[PDB]
């Protein structure tokens, strides 16, 4: 198989707004869409079982003024919800292990071997970085001191809407420059938040390299042109 | 196809027409016993007076000495939403007791157990009512009671813009013909379960009644057992034999 994906630009397979397709033996399927702003998007052919040779591609979107559609930016005079809610994410190195905090079914394979100083292997202080979500400009404690339990090391609950102000205030503080990238989202020419090679002028530059200690906010306004269809489920 | 057939003059007692002192009705009720008449709360609140007459198959005409069931006062309901619709059930406090005649037949009381066996089997139902929920241009002089099927719960929250809870669900045909606001408000959607008759629906208007061919709104009195029990035993024994039986109660239905 081939785990293909259309970064940024979202297709419409079977009249359904999707951005991924991974079947086998060349399934009889075609799609179509409508391009957006100019830029350099990515065709991420991320195939884990097929990477010893190389398979990468991108999208080169220029600008030829021919026709203009009736695409309105904001919602049509009813929905806005302009709020000052920016998702705070700090790439911390809190002590997180494979076994849960005080395991229930007793994961002795990792508790008494790698979780602490038992068996004299790794230790207790780890550097496992996890993407969380804070409630203020502190970068040290979220809604609670530990985690939300229901997600663990996985990302918590994040919902998007019109003018959701997806301003990911990312501030790395570990030992390797990290960033963030939502699956299939169109951003601004100023902020990156996507593995893009589009390095143009200072006006349309985008760099996601966030060194440990430096903070960067990926500001972009998610509006009505970032929502799926009507027949599918609510939140994709 | 079974269309809008009128009610029979035999087994169709549940029709307590709630009118006014003048020649102007508003909604209807449900006959179950001699101390409580289930109907919508907007029948009396934000309306006019209250005049009930059981066994009245026609409003303009009269079939003799049969329509007599006057009401003294009335109260409201706790969960009754004034703006929308939710648990829209009100009890009419009659003033004169009426025996069991031909056009006045009693019915057994519902229970919480008939909630998982009545909705999965009887996927249909009948809506008894003179026709006062949609009093626009279909005011029939004859007591009409059409048949409406039951639909899945996942297709009732989108029938109207108002989010519907569990108390009310679908009780009509698909988006084809006119199957909503049938009969009088507070109309009994009694479903013949098995050897008995238990009402399980009250037709009410949500945002009024216009081009509502999608689905209908009908309550479920199986969950309303805690309200019909708190307003029957806490009131005590009938003092003057149904005065008020008993209207002297708090507004949130005790």
């Amino acid at each position: 198989l081939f785990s293909i994906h259309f970064n940024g630009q979202v297709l419409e397979q079977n009249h359904h707004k999707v951005s991924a397709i991974t079947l086998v033996s060349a399934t009889s399927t075609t799609a179509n869409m409508t391009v957006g702003p100019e830029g350099k998007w990515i065709i991420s052919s991320l195939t884990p079982k097929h990477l010893q040779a190389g398979m990468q591609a991108y999208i080169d979107i220029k600008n030829c003024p021919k026709k203009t559609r009736n695409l309105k930016k904001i919602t049509r005079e009813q929905r806005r919800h302009m709020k000052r809610w920016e998702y705070f994410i700090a790439a911390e190195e809190v002590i997180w292990d494979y076994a849960p905090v005080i395991p229930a079914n007793m994961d002795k394979k990792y508790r008494s071997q790698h979780l602490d100083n038992f068996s004299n292997q790794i230790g207790k202080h780890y550097k496992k970085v996890m993407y969380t979500q804070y409630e203020d400009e502190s970068f040290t404690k979220h809604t609670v001191n530990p985690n939300m339990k229901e997600d663990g090391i996985l990302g918590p609950i994040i919902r998007a809407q019109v003018r959701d102000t997806l301003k990911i205030v990312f501030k790395n503080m570990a030992s390797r420059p990290y960033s963030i990238y939502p699956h299939g989202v169109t951003f601004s020419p100023y902020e990156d938040e996507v593995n893009s090679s589009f390095t143009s002028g200072r006006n349309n530059t985008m760099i996601r390299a966030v060194q440990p200690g430096e903070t960067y906010t990926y500001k972009w306004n998610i509006l009505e042109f970032d929502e799926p269809t009507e027949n599918d489920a609510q939140c994709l | 196809i079974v269309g809008g057939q009128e009610c029979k003059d035999g087994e169709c007692p549940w029709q307590a027409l709630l009118i006014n002192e003048e020649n102007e009705g508003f909604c209807g009720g449900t006959i179950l016993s001699e101390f409580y008449i289930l109907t919508a709360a907007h029948c009396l609140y934000q309306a006019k007076r209250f005049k009930v007459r059981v066994g009245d198959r026609n409003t303009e005409q009269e079939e003799g000495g049969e329509a007599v069931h006057e009401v003294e006062v009335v109260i409201k309901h706790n969960r009754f939403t004034k703006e929308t619709y939710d648990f829209d059930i009100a009890v009419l406090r009659l003033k004169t007791p009426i025996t069991f005649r031909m056009n006045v037949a009693p019915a057994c009381l519902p229970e919480r157990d008939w909630a998982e066996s009545t909705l999965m089997t009887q996927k249909t139902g009948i809506v008894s009512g003179f026709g006062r929920t949609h009093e626009k241009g279909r005011q029939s002089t004859r007591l009409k009671m059409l048949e409406v099927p039951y639909v899945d719960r996942n297709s009732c929250k989108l029938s109207s813009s108002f989010i519907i809870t569990q108390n009310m669900f679908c009780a009509g045909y698909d988006t084809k013909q006119e199957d909503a606001c049938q009969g009088d408000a507070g109309g009994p959607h009694v479903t013949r379960f098995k050897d008995t008759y238990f009402v399980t629906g009250i037709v009410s208007w949500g945002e009024g009644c216009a081009r509502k061919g999608k689905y209908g709104i009908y309550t479920k009195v199986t969950a309303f057992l805690k309200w019909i029990d708190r307003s029957m035993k806490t009131r005590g024994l009938p003092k003057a034999k149904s005065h008020a039986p008993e209207v002297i109660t708090s507004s949130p239905l005790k």
């Binding site: 009813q78 | 813009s161 949500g206």
Partner: protein
């Protein structure tokens, strides 16, 4: 048609009275008729010459030709000689016949054909629908000498509201000639007129010195009153959606939250107009207290869509403004009106001037009552009877075509006050709706059952005491073209409910020209923009009304209040 019982009167009268002796007590019991008894003397009596034989004429026995004088027609012939059908008998529009529909309903007073209500002078004539002539005779054939009566007609054949105009013409509208500037009175009433910059000047032709986007005019003489405007045949291009590009410029939200002190506008001057500038949209009821009663209950259009309207009840206290017209003797309901302040009162023009009706009022028989919730009741502590004394006609009063701008304007001299039952209303301008094309806020057109007793009859509902509102929804344009057989000017739109099978309707309530008072959702204030004209949709079979786009005429009031100080 089913059983031998109803088809017995056709073959009964054969050789007993057609060519024999009969009168009243000789051949009366051989007819068998219980309901159609009195009308039998008029149906059989039609052949003025002779009724013999039977298998030849068949005019005064069934209904085919019009031998004799022509009084009825059984066939379905709606054509006349101009394409427009005859006027319906169950309504009086635009003229008023001698009889209505209350003298004899047994003679089928429906289906507008070719009949004769009074004497016969030529044949089955009709009433002219257009205000041009008065009668339009038909061309119904006649037995015997098949000849054509009258000769039939084959009837076979600057953009941006006009700014940079350079035409060379000088044609008035009615009959008010205007001279030039080299006469004597060149600069008369011109002390506060706001001059713009667009068209140049000229000697004696149609020009636009003020700078109006409506039309051009000149300084006429005649009588010290108003002035006429020039007319030019442009094009029928509608001001619908713009075909350029495809984007807009409107807002996107305006967040829910009443944060508005006093951001109102002012166009007129308090000096030469009076009040009605600041006191607007401030009713001591449920406006300043930030509350909601049972008035504006209009949520989303996707309530549950719409089916058939009914018209609910009302309550005393929700309809403050109520300006109508009445007569001192007798006291009968006329048509609706409006009020912009406390002096100039405007109303419709199709209820005051009608040359064909031969009734022109002066400055005494034109009364006006403001603030009323019933008809039989009569108080004094809540309202006061007003009185008019000044009348003014409209320059472009071309009502003989398709009713083009029929709005009158009087003047009130009684210094009345403003309380709970009397509420004034301002007027919008242009600096607030420059791109609000995707809207359509309706007004509060109150009134009882008055329109049903002015043009038609409508037997069933008399004069109800319920403040019934009138809905005026917004519609496209081709909705009343594929099904409507009569043409309509692009200046006026359509208003009506699409019938499903063939039902009538109940949407012509209120008054004949109620006030269109709309609350502005920007600062919570009632505004007045537009006047409801003549309505239609309850006399045929559920059609569409006609309402002309009358949104301008704002600067015309300012240029005629100059005689208050002179």
């Amino acid at each position: 048609a089913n059983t031998f019982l109803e088809e017995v009167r056709k073959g009964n009268l054969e050789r007993e009275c057609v060519e024999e002796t009969c009168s009243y007590e000789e051949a009366f019991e051989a007819l068998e008729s219980s309901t159609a008894t009195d009308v039998f003397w008029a149906k059989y009596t039609a052949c003025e010459t002779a009724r013999t034989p039977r298998d030849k004429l068949a005019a005064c026995l069934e209904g085919n030709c019009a031998e004799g004088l022509g009084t009825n027609y059984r066939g379905h012939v709606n054509i006349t000689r101009s394409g427009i059908e005859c006027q319906l008998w169950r309504s009086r529009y635009p003229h008023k016949p001698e009889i209505n529909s209350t003298t004899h309903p047994g003679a089928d007073l429906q289906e507008n054909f070719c009949r004769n209500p009074d004497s016969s002078t030529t044949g089955p004539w009709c009433y002219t629908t257009d205000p041009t002539v008065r009668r339009q005779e038909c061309s119904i054939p006649v037995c015997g000498q098949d000849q054509v009566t009258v000769a039939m007609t084959p009837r076979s054949e600057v953009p941006d509201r006009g700014q940079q105009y350079q035409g060379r013409l000088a044609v008035t509208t009615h009959g008010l000639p205007c001279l030039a500037w080299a006469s004597a009175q060149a600069k008369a009433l011109s002390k506060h007129q706001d001059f713009n910059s667009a068209v140049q000047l000229v000697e004696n032709f149609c020009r636009n010195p003020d700078g109006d986007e409506e039309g051009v005019w000149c300084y006429v003489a005649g009588k010290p009153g108003d002035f006429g405007y020039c007319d030019l045949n442009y094009c029928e291009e509608a001001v619908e959606e713009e075909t350029g590009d495809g984007l807009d410029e409107d807002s996107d939200r305006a967040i829910e939250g009443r944060t508005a002190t006093s951001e109102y506008q002012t166009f007129f001057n308090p000096r030469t107009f009076g009040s009605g500038e600041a006191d607007c949209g401030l009713r001591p009821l449920f406006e300043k207290k930030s509350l909601e009663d049972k008035t504006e209950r209009e949520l989303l259009e996707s309530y549950i869509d719409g089916r058939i309207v009914e018209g609910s009840d009302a309550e005393i206290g929700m309809s403050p403004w109520q300006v109508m017209l009445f007569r001192k003797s007798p006291q009968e309901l006329l048509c609706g009106a409006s009020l912009i302040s406390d002096r100039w009162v405007l109303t419709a023009a199709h209820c005051l001037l009608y040359p064909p009706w031969d009734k022109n009022f002066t400055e005494n028989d034109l009364l006006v009552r403001i603030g009323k919730h019933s008809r039989t009741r009569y108080e004094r502590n809540i309202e006061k009877i007003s009185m008019l004394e000044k009348i003014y006609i409209h320059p472009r009063y071309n009502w003989r075509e398709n009713l083009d701008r029929d709005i009158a304007l009087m003047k009130l001299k009684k210094p009345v006050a403003f309380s709970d039952y009397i509420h004034p209303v301002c007027l919008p301008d242009r600096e607030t709706a420059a791109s609000l094309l995707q809207a359509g806020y309706k007004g509060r057109v109150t009134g009882w059952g008055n329109l049903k007793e002015t043009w038609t009859a409508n037997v069933g509902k008399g004069q109800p005491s319920v403040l019934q509102v009138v809905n005026l929804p917004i519609v496209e344009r081709p909705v009343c073209k594929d099904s409507t057989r009569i043409r309509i000017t692009d200046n006026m739109f359509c208003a009506g409910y699409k019938p499903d099978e063939g039902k009538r309707g109940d949407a012509c309530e209120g008054d004949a020209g109620g006030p269109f008072v709309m609350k502005s959702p920007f600062n919570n204030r009632w505004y007045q923009m537009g006047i409801v004209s003549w309505g239609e949709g309850c006399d045929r079979d559920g059609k569409y009304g006609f309402y002309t786009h009358v949104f301008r005429l704002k600067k015309w009031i300012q240029k005629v209040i100059d005689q208050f100080g002179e």
